[PDB]
Amino acid sequence: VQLVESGGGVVQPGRSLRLSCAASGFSFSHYAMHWVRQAPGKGLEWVAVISYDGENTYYADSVKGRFSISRDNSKNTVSLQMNSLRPEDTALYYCARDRIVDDYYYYGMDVWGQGATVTVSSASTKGPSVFPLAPSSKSTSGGTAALGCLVKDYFPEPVTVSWNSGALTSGVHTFPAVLQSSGLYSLSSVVTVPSSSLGTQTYICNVNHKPSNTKVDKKVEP
């Protein structure tokens, strides 16, 4: 049982964008398919539904006339075409399976996909620039000194930051992103390590930004 969704991204207000969702593991041709969106940090919002035969489509009032739902049972896909997008449409969209099979009355969602993020902001997509927050040379001999990475000027969210490709996890703090005055995001990832370890073990942070296909490895040295 699996619903894999695709087609997300960033799209300027007023333009169009089509989401697709492929199903595998069940008799897709007999289940009604829902589209349900969720704004960042807010609750769930029902978007649309299409019956098992594809001859009954229902849309929410806030997306009526703009969105259009379609299905293809020969390939087990559901497509949601959204044109004339407002900024309030920025959300994470799930495709979901209807609990009850082979009906014209729709009941609820029991199998949910992972979702596709749709951002409407007029700003473009920019990969992040990674700057090293290098350890101070005053650090005591003991001494528990600290270093890190500054992931600056990226859009949209999110970026994932690891250390030594995951080999370093203890004492790592990756802060939540902040929205800079430029309209782009920025965060910091800091690690506290024994001062006697500097100059002996290589410290590299790995920054990943999927929306821009950006993979950065930043080596931090004193």
Binding site: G25, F26, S27, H30, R99, I100, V101, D102, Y107
Partner: protein, 60 residues
């Protein structure tokens, strides 16, 4: 003599309906897991109706 005035209907439509819902990918594993414990169990079918299920013979 008035046998022609009555309407015609499908006698096994309910059983055929229960069969068509059992052909879905899965739904057999549902019954198998339900009957894993005892020989009788109520199972909620994918069409919503809950039906009683018996394991009348254990050959495996």
């Amino acid at each position: 003599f008035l046998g022609f005035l009555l309407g015609v209907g499908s006698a096994i439509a309910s059983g055929v309906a229960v069969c068509k819902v059992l052909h879905l990918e899965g739904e057999v594993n549902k019954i198998k897991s339900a009957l894993l414990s005892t020989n009788k169990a109520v199972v909620s079918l994918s069409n919503g109706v809950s039906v009683l299920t018996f394991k009348v013979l254990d050959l495996k």
